[PDB]
């Protein structure tokens, strides 16, 4: 058996074909087992509508999840990604930093 803590990256992107739109992304990588809980947060509250959740695995059965959705950030709102996994004794919250 192997267990591996996910790496978590939180960032924003504009799709080049629709540049006025903006996406909040949580990329959760390299984890095992695949059991996992992932949410995007706006001002500490779970975002219920997350339109994309893309899961894959590599050759060594490491899992990769891109969890992302359209958002409209203001400078007062705080966004983050919250992950729980067996390797994490408490939920891990990673903020979207200003500029990312």
Numbering used by the authors: 0 to 99
What did the original publication write about this model?
The Trp95Leu mutant was crystallised according to the protocol used for the Trp60Val β2-m mutant, yielding crystals belonging to the same space group and with the same crystal packing observed for the β2-m DE loop mutants, as recently reported. Trp95Leu mutant crystals diffracted to a resolution of 1.57 Å. In accordance with the single residue mutation, the Trp95Leu mutant crystal structure is very similar to that of wild-type β2-m (R.S.M.D. 0.55 Å, calculated over 97 Cα pairs), and the mutated Leu95 side chain matches the location of the Trp95 indole ring in the wild-type protein. On the other hand, the cavity created by residues Ser11, Asn21, Leu23, Phe70, Pro72 and Tyr78, which perfectly fits the bulky side chain of Trp95 in wild-type β2-m, is only half filled by Leu95. Given the hydrophobicity of the cavity, however, no water molecules appear to fill the gaps, leaving the cavity partially empty. Such a condition is unfavourable for protein stability and, together with the loss of an H bond, certainly contributes to the lower stability observed for the Trp95Leu mutant. Consequently, the presence of the mutated Leu95 residue is reflected by increased flexibility of the downstream residues. The whole 96-99 segment displays poor electron density, and could only be modelled with 0.5 occupancy. In the Trp95Leu isoform the electron density for the DE loop is of poor quality; such a loop was modelled in two alternative conformations, with residual electron density suggesting an even higher number of conformations. The presence of Leu at site 95 induces a destabilization of 1.0 kcal/mol, with a Cm shift from 1.9 to 1.65 M GdnHCl.
We have recently discovered that the two tryptophans of human β2-microglobulin have distinctive roles within the structure and function of the protein. Deeply buried in the core, Trp95 is essential for folding stability, whereas Trp60, which is solvent-exposed, plays a crucial role in promoting the binding of β2-microglobulin to the heavy chain of the class I major histocompatibility complex (MHCI). We have discovered that Trp60 is highly conserved, whereas, in some of the most basal taxa, Leu is present in position 95. To understand the possible positive effects of the replacement of Leu95 with Trp we investigated the structural impact of this mutation on human β2-m.
